[PDB]
């Protein structure tokens, strides 16, 4: 019962949608303590790898991390839940995002994320006026 | 198994913390379809009540809704989960926030929220530099 990567089926629903707008990716990551590489690192080291490797691609296709906070408390919700990273990445198009997922460099660097995450959420949002 | 309002115990932990900074309240609300007033409305009407009534107080004590998006997809996560409202409210101090929860007007207007929500999350975050 840990969600690390998306479904074949659900990812289609994502590409299916493609309104022209930008998109907001709410990311809720909970790292595991012992990273899970086939082939000794910690979770947070393993995630930072992904980060160091993902960025260059995301920068290039025009992703930007808009907002990001530090988990302090779960005021409403199950005490079990606790996220180690909370942030919103913006992409200018569903197409920009897809093109990243297919990039060689990304594809290799997600192997790191695949090994660092105990559980994640990734929600697609159409940003609105405050 | 639906989380509407915080615990006595956990709310201490909140007041306990009080770093000087601002705070970011990530709000994930899932409205129910038939509102649950003691005393016939829909959920979304019942929530909009809370909104109309909570703003004035929150404006006054210096809360502001910074960001807000519209749920489109759950790319990573359980398909069961689906949020009807996603937003981040900013308060200038843990103290500002508490003082709101105690306000007469708020206290009456949360009765509406109490009746509209099927399930929610409310996470406290110390915002960081992107």
UniProtKB/TrEMBL annotation, chains A, B:
Pfam families: DUF1330 (PF07045). Residues 42-119 form the DUF1330 domain. The modification N6,N6-dimethyllysine is found at residue 64. It comes from the Bacteria. The modification N6-methyllysine is found at residues 64, 111, 126. InterPro entries: Dimeric_a/b-barrel (IPR011008), DUF1330 (IPR010753). Gene3D superfamilies: 3.30.70.100. PANTHER family: DUF1330 DOMAIN-CONTAINING PROTEIN, PTHR40257. This is DUF1330 domain-containing protein.
């Amino acid at each position: 019962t840990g969600h690390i990567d998306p479904t074949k089926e659900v990812f289609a629903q994502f590409r299916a949608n493609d309104r022209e707008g930008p998109i907001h990716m709410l990311n809720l990551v909970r790292l595991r303590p012992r990273a899970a590489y086939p082939d000794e690192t910690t979770g947070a080291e393993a995630y930072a790898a992904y980060g160091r490797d993902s960025g260059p691609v995301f920068e290039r296709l025009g992703g930007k991390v808009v907002w990001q906070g530090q988990f302090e408390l779960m005021l409403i919700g199950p005490q079990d839940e606790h996220w180690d990273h909370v942030f919103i990445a913006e992409y200018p198009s569903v197409a920009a995002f897809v093109e990243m997922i297919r990039d060689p460099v990304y594809r290799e660097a997600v192997k790191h994320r695949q090994a660092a995450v105990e559980d994640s959420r990734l929600i697609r949002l159409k940003p609105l006026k405050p």
